[PDB]
Design a protein around this ligand. Structure first.
Ligand SMILES: Nc1ncnc2c1ncn2[C@@H]1O[C@H](CSCC[C@H](N)C(=O)O)[C@@H](O)[C@H]1O
Ligand SMILES: Nc1ncnc2c1ncn2[C@@H]1O[C@H](CSCC[C@H](N)C(=O)O)[C@@H](O)[C@H]1O
Ligand SMILES: O=Cc1ccc(O)c(O)c1
Ligand SMILES: [Mg+2]
Ligand SMILES: [Mg+2]
Lengths: 239, 236
């Protein structure tokens, strides 16, 4: 989508039955706890032409909760867009935390950069403007035990999730977390066939159905599929 | 009894097919065998609704491992699915303080927990948790604080359990409250057609959700998994 919208047939990625329950969750437990600059970044992004790709706000507060409970301090993110999940991660890490951000389109990143600077956490971010898989392939060859990541957030092009997985279970430390966004894909994953989809909407649906089967059978990780936001899967490296 | 209630089987996801997809694809292949046996015996029990969701169970296990929890406390054991999930996730030297008013529910799943080989990690306490939490407030040194707390007992007492647990859990420790979305009924000021006790839990959770969101002693994150849960993290 972004990097390669109204052509989509699916509109609401949140998988809940009630829009009133979703609004309740956001106004009761998210917006009161949402950073001032995360709010400004969100409102601007909701007016962008690819606003559907914006990470869910309740999904953002959850990622921040995981980063602190696991005391993550060196993370990597694949797929930044305007940087809501990047700013969420930067606010969650300690003062000397470091993030390796990767996106093919920096013009999306510069939409949220003013909010990242005014939040005072831009110093933690190393933005790489490139396709992620070439960067991950170099990282694995030059990999030292010292330079392992604690946490990986995958939110870029959807068909490449399985390929990203093979690199990230070597680039993330044992006991580290790998979180994949959109693993429930508008609920269309629960059906072998889903008519009425754009060709790449259907390609992402098939790729997630295959990815969810692969992750559930991968002994290198423990998995946990969480029905929050667009749906996400948490993988924890065992070896 | 169980069929007097109206909210036993109301989903929060938009499809029963989507939930069944999650369980069959990502939960049952990763479910311990003793957790399967405990789950299938409990679904036949008179109070099968109180059993924690299986996708929720894997999620609690993931939290305990990522935060490297070692000493936890559970309030509301029932047959022990969340207890066996916790005891399976902690290191072999991990300890759990399990509290429930009903020892008879616990011994239903005790054979599965003994066959799983994790009974040595659990210290069950047959009592109301609120008198137990108060005695620990006077008896606990700073280095005995818990890393994790799972609240899943009588719902109108969550806010009272919270005041005790924000001082019994370590700084940076986690407190998880189950059913904080109460079958989706918390989204409305009024909700007709509910059992009186169901309506009482619904207004208690609407109060608790606003309480936890304004509690500066913790950071929160409400997660719409299973029946809905809220993760709190102690700040001071
Ligand atoms: N091949 C690729 N490699 C790396 N990033 C890619 C990519 N293809 C697309 N992307 C990027 O992935 C992003 C997906 S939108 C991601 C939203 C963001 N995670 C948030 O929190 O809101 C887009 O910005 C797009 O530029
Ligand atoms: N005041 C109290 N103190 C401690 N436990 C209580 C309590 N009141 C009720 N309970 C117990 O809390 C349990 C709630 S059902 C909890 C289910 C369990 N968490 C699971 O994984 O399935 C019941 O078994 C009930 O006996
Ligand atoms: O590409 C479309 C898209 C749609 C929703 C998302 O959450 C996302 O990351 C991308
Ligand atoms: Mg996404
Ligand atoms: Mg429960």
């Amino acid at each position: 989508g972004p990097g390669m919208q109204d052509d989509y047939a699916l509109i609401h990625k949140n998988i809940l039955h009630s829009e009133d329950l979703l609004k309740y969750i956001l106004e009761t437990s998210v917006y009161p706890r949402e950073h001032e600059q995360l709010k400004g970044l969100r409102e601007v992004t909701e007016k962008h032409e690819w606003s559907m790709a914006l990470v869910a706000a309740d999904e953002g507060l959850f990622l921040s909760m995981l980063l602190k409970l696991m005391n993550a301090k060196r993370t990597i993110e694949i797929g930044v867009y305007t940087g809501y999940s990047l700013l969420t991660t930067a606010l969650a890490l300690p003062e000397d935390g470091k993030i390796t951000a990767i996106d093919v389109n920096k013009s999306y990143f510069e939409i949220g950069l003013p909010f990242i600077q005014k939040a005072g956490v831009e110093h933690k971010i190393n933005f790489i403007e490139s396709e992620a898989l070439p960067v991950l392939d170099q990282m694995l060859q030059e990999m030292k035990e010292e330079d392992l990541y604690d946490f990986a957030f995958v939110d870029a092009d959807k068909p490449n999730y399985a390929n990203y997985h093979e690199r990230l279970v070597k680039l993330v430390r044992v006991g580290g977390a790998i979180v994949y966004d959109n693993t429930l894909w508008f609920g269309t994953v629960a059906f072998p066939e889903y008519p009425g989809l754009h060709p790449e909407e259907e390609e992402c649906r098939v790729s997630f159905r295959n990815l969810n089967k692969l992750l559930a059978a991968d002994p290198r990780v423990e998995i946990s599929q969480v029905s929050i936001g667009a749906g996400l899967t948490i993988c924890r490296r065992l070896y």
